[PDB]
């Protein structure tokens, strides 16, 4: 006998863990879990319908930036999986598995788990050219990066090369990056920086990597697809309950036709209308 109200006005304040598979990032952004920040090792190869990113999340590894951050974040979020497939690249002539004191894993100098810091070997950094063929029937996503040393001395001691150059190509595309040597403010006492890039390799296409220095190399690929998973920023706790619709303010019932809680929703939801 309630009077008709077609607008859902309130949320339960929490996000229900059913029926959608919720992955709570806690202290880890999706990108940090993608790259393999040591504090994010528990996220390896996890799957999700909705990844939830928290305001409190923070980075605790080598200071980096991602020029096309939103597109990479959206690429992984929609695939719904962090499953990583290692591949054996032929890195002949260089030293692998560089580590840093800004990235501690188990009380030891370490690095992003999914990236490979290549440096000179006996003060020789040859012109690397490696290929990876992609014989699968899905797209491959490769994450790589460029290291920006702080001085010419740093560049020389790391890569035995004053001018590193990186090119990552497929039959469809070409990406060329040049390191920028210079002082940045110290983040966790590190005045250097890394820039993260990504490349999609479609089935039947080949990945080609050329580098004369400064390459933060991939260790393999992620499977990518424009699926139905997504990502959301929210500080609402994950609770035990069942609710088909999810907003950053918490889960919502889907019986009313309309909704004024949040423009951002996930699942089967009422249509948003303003206040």
């Amino acid at each position: 006998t309630n009077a008709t109200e077609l607008v859902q006005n309130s949320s339960i304040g929490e996000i229900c863990d059913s029926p959608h598979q919720i992955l709570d990032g806690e202290n880890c952004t999706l990108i940090d879990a993608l790259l393999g920040d040591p504090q994010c090792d528990g996220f390896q190869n996890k799957k999700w319908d909705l990844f939830v990113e928290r305001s409190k999340a923070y980075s605790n590894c080598y200071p980096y930036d991602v020029p096309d951050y939103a597109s990479l974040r959206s690429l992984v979020a929609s695939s719904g999986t962090l499953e990583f497939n290692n591949e054996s690249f032929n890195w002949n002539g260089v030293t692998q598995n560089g580590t840093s004191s800004a990235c501690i894993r188990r009380s030891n100098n370490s690095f992003f788990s999914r990236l490979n810091w290549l440096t000179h070997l006996n003060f020789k950094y040859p012109a690397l050219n490696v290929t990876m063929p992609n014989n699968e029937q899905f797209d491959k996503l490769y994450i790589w990066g460029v290291h920006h040393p702080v001085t010419d001395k740093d560049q020389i001691f790391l890569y035995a090369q004053p001018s590193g150059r990186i090119t990552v190509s497929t039959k469809r595309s070409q990406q060329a990056v040049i390191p920028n040597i210079g002082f940045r403010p110290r983040i966790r006492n590190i005045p250097s920086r890394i820039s993260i890039y990504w490349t999609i390799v479609k089935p039947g296409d080949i990945l080609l990597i050329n580098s004369t220095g400064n390459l933060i190399a991939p260790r393999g690929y992620f499977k990518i697809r424009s699926g139905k998973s997504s990502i959301m920023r929210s500080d609402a706790p994950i609770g035990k309950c069942k609710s088909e619709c999810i907003t950053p303010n918490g889960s919502i019932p889907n019986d009313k036709p309309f909704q004024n809680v949040n423009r951002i929703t996930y699942g089967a939801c009422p249509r948003y209308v303003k206040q």
Partner: antibody
Amino acid sequence: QVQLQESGPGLVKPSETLSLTCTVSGGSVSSNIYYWSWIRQTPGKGLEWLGYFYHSGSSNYNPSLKSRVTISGDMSKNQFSLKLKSVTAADTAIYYCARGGVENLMLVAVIQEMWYFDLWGRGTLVTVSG
Amino acid sequence: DIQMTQTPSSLSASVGDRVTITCRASQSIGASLNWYQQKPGEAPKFLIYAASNLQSGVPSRFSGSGSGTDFTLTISSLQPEDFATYYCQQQGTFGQGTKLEIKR
């Protein structure tokens, strides 16, 4: 190390164009990760950022200074200059040149624009008076 | 557009004391806040970057903390040479400053 040093007149008449030049020693003024800035300090305001300039032609200025500010550079001389039009007594200040930069770093779940000024000159007093 | 409030404007503390200086933004600024130390007759010195990262030449007794709107600069054990004016800074705006005198 890299060092900055301001040069210019210490007394400027009102309605004149204040001009100061910063000379950079030991560093590559040519590197587009750095911008080159001017900040002034008066007791009664403290520090006030005036503007910065990238050699690539990009620049950014304090809107409080109604576009009276122009910063330009010359790499033949490893120098950049401040120009401040139509000065009055309110422009009497200690003027500093500074090096800094802009970073787009993710932290607190959101990428934000960060500015900084990591290297400063010694500063120069400019008195605007008749 | 964003204005920061530094408290207190001035204070005195003894050698060995722990002093904390607060900067508060009118809006959230994430962690995009830096600190500078200006000793008398000198230009400001780059102290802390992105709320908590100590810069080169900064003694270990300096630390910073905060997120969103409330940020603090802490000197764990005050020294006579720490006499200076301290400034917070976010993008193109500086705090009003905090002058720190050494009690004696």
